[PDB]
């Protein structure tokens, strides 16, 4: 497991090192550089179960959202991006860095065995359910989650919806307007990081 | 089994039970020194300070 962890931990740097390098080249050259896009997104609910249109009620069921303040890890693509805009005033998403993808599966990491919520406090809890996909521990699970791989669907169905608390320090002032006019709803991009460092 | 949900961020024993890498991390490696060079192109600084 450590032999896998040493490979993963050095790789997170070796991809963070190059985006340090590959921007230090272009900015000193006059070239421009779009980044490797976000492929993972993390969706946290903002509104309760009251007065939701039936069109947006089904979709949040299809994202394991059944309670206010639930985070989930879901694969981000086109057909996910156009699905989030129709539930946009009832969710909130953004890019997770490596720290939140650690602190959410170490603090509030709960697996799904026999349709029961069983925590991720032992590798044998993970080896039983996800052994057949070469996932052997939390560190294999973090790599497979955060660095999206082929089994990401088979791993996002393992973790429970991340039931979080209300953010220490509160939200912003008035909550249910789009994030780009104050408030907090819709995409938060890198600022979903500083939101999970409050609830957790 | 599992009567309490121990926290592997705030407990330093269950962390080693879950992650057999905590005996070698070195979170802060000095990958630079005094000799860091400026990498700021002229034409980028021209389009920076334009307008």
């Amino acid at each position: 497991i450590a032999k896998r962890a040493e490979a993963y931990e050095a790789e997170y740097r070796a991809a963070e090192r190059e985006q340090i390098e590959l921007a230090r080249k272009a900015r000193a050259e006059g070239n421009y550089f779009v980044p490797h896009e976000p492929k993972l997104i993390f969706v946290v609910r903002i509104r309760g179960i009251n007065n939701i249109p039936p069109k947006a009620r089904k979709i949040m069921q299809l994202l394991r959202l059944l309670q206010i303040n639930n985070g989930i890890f879901v694969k981000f693509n086109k057909a996910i991006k156009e699905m989030l805009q129709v539930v946009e005033p009832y969710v909130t998403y953004g890019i997770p860095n490596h720290k939140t993808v650690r602190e959410l599966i170490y603090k509030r990491g709960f697996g799904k065995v026999n349709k029961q919520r069983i925590p991720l406090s032992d590798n044998a809890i993970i080896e039983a359910a996800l052994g057949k996909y070469s996932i052997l521990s939390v560190e294999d699970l973090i790599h497979e989650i955060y660095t999206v791989g082929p089994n990401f669907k088979q791993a996002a169905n393992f973790l429970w919806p991340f039931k979080l608390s209300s953010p220490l320090g509160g939200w912003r002032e008035r909550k249910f307007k789009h994030f780009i006019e104050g408030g907090d709803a819709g995409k938060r991009d890198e600022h979903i990081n500083g939101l999970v460092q409050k609830m957790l | 089994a599992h009567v309490q949900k121990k926290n592997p961020l705030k407990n330093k024993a269950v962390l080693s039970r879950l992650n057999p890498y905590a005996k070698a991390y070195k979170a802060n490696v000095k990958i630079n020194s005094e000799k860091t060079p400026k990498a700021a192109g002229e034409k980028f600084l021209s389009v920076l300070h334009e307008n």
Partner: peptide
Amino acid sequence: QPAPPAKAHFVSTENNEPVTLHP
């Protein structure tokens, strides 16, 4: 199967200098 979104790439500006606009 879905069409994947876009990875990164350079874009050179020797023949295309960024012009400055105003709203």
